[PDB]
Every structure is written in structure tokens, then in C-alpha cells.
Amino acid sequence: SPQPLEQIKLSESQLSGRVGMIEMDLASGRTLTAWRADERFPMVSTFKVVLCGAVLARVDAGDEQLERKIHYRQQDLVDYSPVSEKHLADGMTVGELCAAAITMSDNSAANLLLATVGGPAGLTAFLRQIGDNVTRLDRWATELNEALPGDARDTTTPASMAATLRKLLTSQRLSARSQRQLLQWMVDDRVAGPLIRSVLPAGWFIADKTGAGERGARGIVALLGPNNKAERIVVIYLRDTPASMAERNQQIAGIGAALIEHWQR
Numbered sequence: 001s002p003q004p005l006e007q008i009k010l011s012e013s014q015l016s017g018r019v020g021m022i023e024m025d026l027a028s029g030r031t032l033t034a035w036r037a038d039e040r041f042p043m044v045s046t047f048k049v050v051l052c053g054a055v056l057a058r059v060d061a062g063d064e065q066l067e068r069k070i071h072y073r074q075q076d077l078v079d080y081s082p083v084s085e086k087h088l089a090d091g092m093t094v095g096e097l098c099a100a101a102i103t104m105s106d107n108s109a110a111n112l113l114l115a116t117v118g119g120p121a122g123l124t125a126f127l128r129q130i131g132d133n134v135t136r137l138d139r140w141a142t143e144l145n146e147a148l149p150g151d152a153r154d155t156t157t158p159a160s161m162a163a164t165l166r167k168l169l170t171s172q173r174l175s176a177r178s179q180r181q182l183l184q185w186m187v188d189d190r191v192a193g194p195l196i197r198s199v200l201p202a203g204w205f206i207a208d209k210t211g212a213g214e215r216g217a218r219g220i221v222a223l224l225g226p227n228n229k230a231e232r233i234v235v236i237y238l239r240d241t242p243a244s245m246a247e248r249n250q251q252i253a254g255i256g257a258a259l260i261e262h263w264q265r
């Protein structure tokens with residue numbers, strides 16, 4: 001594989017779309033690679049990680065409990081609720097809802113949680129409170145993936161997202177237990193995690209949340225590193241490409257391969 005920046009360029013050339021990327025040391029925030037890092041990209045399902053960071057902040061403040069059971073109705077379900085559709089009779093705890101939203105990208109679970117933090121506006125205000133003045137959530141779970149060109153709704157930038165994830169995971173804004181919980185949910189991703197491990201060389205750590213939307217929108221926020229350590233945060237978004245999902249996946253994997261082959265920078 002070529003150097004990371006050269007692979008990123010090749011990916012835009014092959015997809016006819018924009019790639020947004022940031023590679024950052026998780027412990028210190030050192031930015032290693034930055035491409036279109038201040039440009040807007042649809043967050044798609046990656047917003048679910050920030051969502052649960054806001055929920056954990058409420059738990060830390062004593063305004064929420066991960067144990068609290070939420071009972072909902074069938075009428076509350078939206079498109080793609082693999083976990084939540086199974087608990088109409090018994091409900092789900094807030095913690096279970098975050099596990100379902102992050103590890104299975106359960107949309108009804110995300111919407112139920114979103115309501116607890118004040119909706120899209122409430123989540124955006126939480127982002128503003130931790131110092132992210134760019135990322136914005138404007139719509140609910142199954143409408144935020146539209147990705148209209150020029151539409152600023154439901155977008156983030158690679159730099160903003162990376163900084164925000166680092167803040168949630170390591171800045172002590174969240175309690176030690178909450179930081180550990182957010183990390184574990186990402187480690188537990190069932191949608192892309194196992195697949196990524198199957199193609200990663202032995203010794204590489206992976207935790208992640210992926211997403212996809214219209215007009216080729218694709219995204220992944222992840223922790224990656226050799227020696228089984230979450231050494232760096234890597235955020236990659238793709239937008240406005242007519243490419244098949246398989247090729248968008250292949251290009252992202254290619255950027256990952258370039259990082260792996262040229263790690264010491």
C-alpha cells in the first residue's frame with residue numbers, strides 16, 4: 001500500500017467522491033494525518049457514539065441511571081430495530097439501549113435515547129458544552145442519513161469528531177466508569193467489528209462505530225493500534241460518490257491498510 005495521504009487521494013479518484021479523514025494519537029491528541037478535516041460530512045450512524053456520551057454525562061450527574069428501564073410501544077419503532085423490536089413486552093434499560101444503538105445500530109434505541117437528552121437540539125447543545133462548535137444533529141435516527149449536497153444538517157467534520165471522541169473517552173469530562181463503558185460499547189460493535197478483525201493482522205486493536213447514508217455517505221469512527229492497544233483515533237467519512245457499498249468499504253479498508261503498513265510517523 002502507498003503512504004496514507006496518497007491512498008486517500010487514490011480513494012477520491014476511484015470513488016469520484018470526497019474523503020474526510022483524521023488520524024490522531026488518542027492519549028495526546030497529536031494530529032498525524034488530516035485531509036479535508038475541516039470540511040462537513042454527514043455523520044450518519046456515527047452520531048450514536050456521541051449520543052451515548054451525552055447519556056453517560058447524565059448518569060454521572062445523577063440525572064440518569066443505566067439501569068433505568070424504559071418501556072416503549074410498537075408505534076415508537078422506526079426502520080431497523082433488531083434489538084428493540086424484541087422487547088415491546090419487557091422494555092430495555094438505558095444501558096441496554098446504548099449497547100443496542102452502538103453495537104447493532106438499532107435506530108429505535110437511538111431515538112429513545114435521543115429523547116432522553118433533549119432530542120437533536122439537546123444533543124447539539126451537549127456538543128457545544130464540551131467545546132465542539134461544529135458538529136450538529138438536526139434530525140432523528142431514520143431521517144438523518146439523507147445526505148443532501150450542501151445540507152449542513154446532521155454533519156460533523158473529521159477534526160471535530162475526532163476531538164469530541166477523544167474528549168469523551170479520555171478528558172475526564174466523563175467519570176472513569178463512564179469512559180470505560182463508552183469504550184467497551186465501541187469495542188463490542190457487532191456490525192463491523194468482527195469483520196474488521198478478520199482482515200486485520202494479528203496484534204491490531206479495533207473499536208468502532210460505522211454508518212452509511214444516501215449519495216454514497218459512509219463513515220467510521222474508530223480506535224486502532226498495534227500491540228493490542230487503542231493507540232489512535234481514526235475518523236473517515238465519504239460523501240457524494242455513486243459507488244457501490246462494497247467499493248466504499250474497500251477504499252476505507254485500503255486507507256486502513258496504508259496506515260497499518262506505514263504506522264510510525
Ligand SMILES: OC[C@H]1O[C@H](O[C@H]2[C@H](O)[C@@H](O)[C@H](OCCCCCCC3CCCCC3)O[C@@H]2CO)[C@H](O)[C@@H](O)[C@@H]1O
Nearest residue numbers: 196199200201220222224234236252253256257260261
Ligand atoms: O506488513 C503489515 C501487514 O501487511 C499485511 O496485512 C494487510 C492485511 O492482510 C489486509 O487484510 C489489511 O487490509 C486492511 C483491513 C483494514 C480494515 C479496516 C480498518 C479501519 C480501522 C480504523 C478506521 C479506518 C479503517 O491490510 C494489511 C496491511 O496491508 C499482511 O497480511 C500482514 O501479515 C502484515 O503484518
Ligand SMILES: *C(=O)/C=C/N[C@@H](C(=O)O)[C@](C)(Cn1ccnn1)[SH](=O)=O
Nearest residue numbers: 044045046079080105191210211212
Ligand atoms: C447508520 O449509519 C445507519 C445506516 N444504515 C442503516 C439504516 O439506515 O438504518 C441500514 C439498516 C443498514 N445498516 C444496518 C446496520 N447498520 N447499518 S440501511 O442502510 O439498510
